[PDB]
Design an enzyme around this catalytic site. Sequence first.
Site, PDB file in Angstrom:
ATOM      1  CG  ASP A  28     -12.748  -3.610  13.641  1.00  0.00           C
ATOM      2  OD1 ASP A  28     -12.305  -3.767  14.782  1.00  0.00           O
ATOM      3  OD2 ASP A  28     -12.523  -2.594  12.937  1.00  0.00           O
TER       4      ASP A  28
ATOM      5  CG  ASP B 200      -3.591  -5.045   1.581  1.00  0.00           C
ATOM      6  OD1 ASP B 200      -3.386  -4.549   2.693  1.00  0.00           O
ATOM      7  OD2 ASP B 200      -4.378  -4.558   0.738  1.00  0.00           O
TER       8      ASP B 200
ATOM      9  CB  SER C  74       0.301  -1.236   5.517  1.00  0.00           C
ATOM     10  OG  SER C  74      -0.594  -0.724   4.533  1.00  0.00           O
TER      11      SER C  74
ATOM     12  CG  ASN D 266      -3.424  -2.924   5.537  1.00  0.00           C
ATOM     13  OD1 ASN D 266      -3.985  -1.882   5.150  1.00  0.00           O
ATOM     14  ND2 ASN D 266      -2.139  -2.960   5.699  1.00  0.00           N
TER      15      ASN D 266
ATOM     16  CG  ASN E 140      -1.773  -1.293   1.235  1.00  0.00           C
ATOM     17  OD1 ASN E 140      -2.346  -1.626   0.197  1.00  0.00           O
ATOM     18  ND2 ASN E 140      -1.849  -1.981   2.364  1.00  0.00           N
TER      19      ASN E 140
ATOM     20  CG  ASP F  25      -0.441   2.812   4.494  1.00  0.00           C
ATOM     21  OD1 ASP F  25       0.026   1.764   4.022  1.00  0.00           O
ATOM     22  OD2 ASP F  25      -1.396   2.801   5.266  1.00  0.00           O
TER      23      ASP F  25
END
Length: 129
Positions: free
Chosen positions: A101, A52, A50, A59, A46, A48
């Site tokens: 979540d 997956d 991170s 993630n 990603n 940023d």
Amino acid sequence: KVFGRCELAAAMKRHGLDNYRGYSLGNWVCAAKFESNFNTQATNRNTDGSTDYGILQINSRWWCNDGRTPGSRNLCNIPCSALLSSDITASVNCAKKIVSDGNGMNAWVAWRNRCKGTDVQAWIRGCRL
Ligand SMILES: [Cl-]
Ligand SMILES: [Cl-]
Ligand SMILES: [Cl-]
Ligand SMILES: [Cl-]
Ligand SMILES: [Cl-]
Ligand SMILES: [Cl-]
Ligand SMILES: [Cl-]
Ligand code: NA
């Protein structure tokens, strides 16, 4: 491992995902198709930093530890490598926590954009389950 459509449906049912949090098996199969093309070894970085991982592209920002995502959590308490196994147990167990979540399957942006509202039963059509 690259699963076939009905082979993955069967494995997801064997690990208790069918109708988990009210999401029929076709939803899970459709999410896997567009996240990973059914490939357990799929990884994608990603913007940023991170990453997956796996059949459901879980993630490192929140769910698994890869050692290279600063400020991240590991809420599934697993190395992200466990999400790349031919056996989908770790991916399913973690996916059950994600879908609990609060935003259901909207956590998977490809599910929201490509599966939500569609004829997801087509994904399990013909399968001996
Ligand atoms: Cl397919
Ligand atoms: Cl379905
Ligand atoms: Cl990290
Ligand atoms: Cl954590
Ligand atoms: Cl770890
Ligand atoms: Cl499996
Ligand atoms: Cl929901
Ligand atoms: Na992490």
